[PDB]
Amino acid sequence: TDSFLLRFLRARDFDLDLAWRLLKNYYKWRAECPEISADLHPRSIIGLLKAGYHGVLRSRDPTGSKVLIYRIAHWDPKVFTAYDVFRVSLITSELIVQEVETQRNGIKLIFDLEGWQFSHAFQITPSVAKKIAAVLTDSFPLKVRGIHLINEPVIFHAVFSMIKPFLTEKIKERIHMHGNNYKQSLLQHFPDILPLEYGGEEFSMEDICQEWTNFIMKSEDYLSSISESIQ
């Protein structure tokens, strides 16, 4: 059985110095005021999962990366805060990091920003923005190998401009903005695995979201134990 350290080693190519620094930040990144709680039980965000906000593709990309999909239109900012939504990503991340192949080949993100509103942007404070940059760079044992933004409205770059200065050069050149005509370019990066809504052949986003919702609910006891092991 793997140590807790092994996922941090694999995240930094078995460089013990870098893995150690990542481990340090992993334990303190939440503590940055205002803090986000260590609670990882799905009960407070099950509405988000049911709304079809988020899902994970069952198949990997050509490099073996786990592929995550987020749909901002299914996040109601009146009901769920940025911290609720961030907690969903933390829950997903703690689950997929258990896979060794994900530890080795990292992850890729697809953000459908269609329906992004100013109400969404209101949630993204400078404190939240730098927390976003933290988990994307050096505060969580997952290698972000690519970030793909699709259907981005012009009003979004104000939010991105808040996040950008806290991003490393490595992650910045891994961010792709495809616009409303995303299908061809997105298909190039992710052949055979995309859902129907994004140019895929077989599965729909609804099934993908429901499947991941079930997996999260099913893993609620592991999530509770992880929450216990970081406080």
Ligand X SMILES: Cc1c(C)c2c(c(C)c1O)CC[C@@](C)(CCC[C@H](C)CCC[C@H](C)CCCC(C)C)O2
Size of the site for ligand X (CB under 6 A): 19
> Going residue by residue from 134 to 163, which x/- string records binding to ligand X, judged by CB under 6 A?
-xx---x-x-x--x-----------x---x
SS3 sequence of the chain: CCCCCHHHHHHCCCCHHHHHHHHHHHHHCCCCCCCCCCCCCHHHCHHHHHCCCEEECCCCCCCCCEEEEEEHHHCCCCCCCHHHHHHHHHHHHHHHCCCHHHHHHCEEEEEECCCCCHHHHHHCCHHHHHHHHHHHHCCCCCCEEEEEEECCCHHHHHHHHHHHHHCCHHHHCCEEEEECCCHHHHHHHCCCCCCHHHCCCCCCHHHHHHHHHHHHHHCHHHHHHHHHCCC
Site membership for ligand X, residue 8 (CB under 6 A): no
Site membership for a second copy, residue 131 (CB under 8 A): no
Residue 62 binding: pick among Cl ion, ligand X, a second copy, none (C-beta 5-8 Å cut-off by kind): a second copy
Q: Which is closer to ligand X, CB of 67 or CB of 135?
A: 135
**Smallest separation (angstroms) from a second copy to the CB of 1:** 9
Site membership for a second copy, residue 115 (CB under 8 A): no
Amino acid 47 reads G
Q: Enumerate binding residues for a second copy (CB under 8 A).
A: 2-6, 9, 14-17, 20, 23-24, 27-28, 31, 33-34, 62-63, 100, 104, 117-119, 122, 153-155, 161, 173, 185, 188-189, 228-231
Pick out the residues of the known binding site. 138, 140, 143-145, 161-164, 170, 174
Q: Enumerate binding residues for Cl ion (CB under 5 A).
A: 37, 83, 154, 176, 185
Q: Enumerate binding residues for ligand X (CB under 6 A).
A: 82, 85-86, 89-90, 93, 107, 109, 111, 124, 132, 135-136, 140, 142, 144, 147, 159, 163
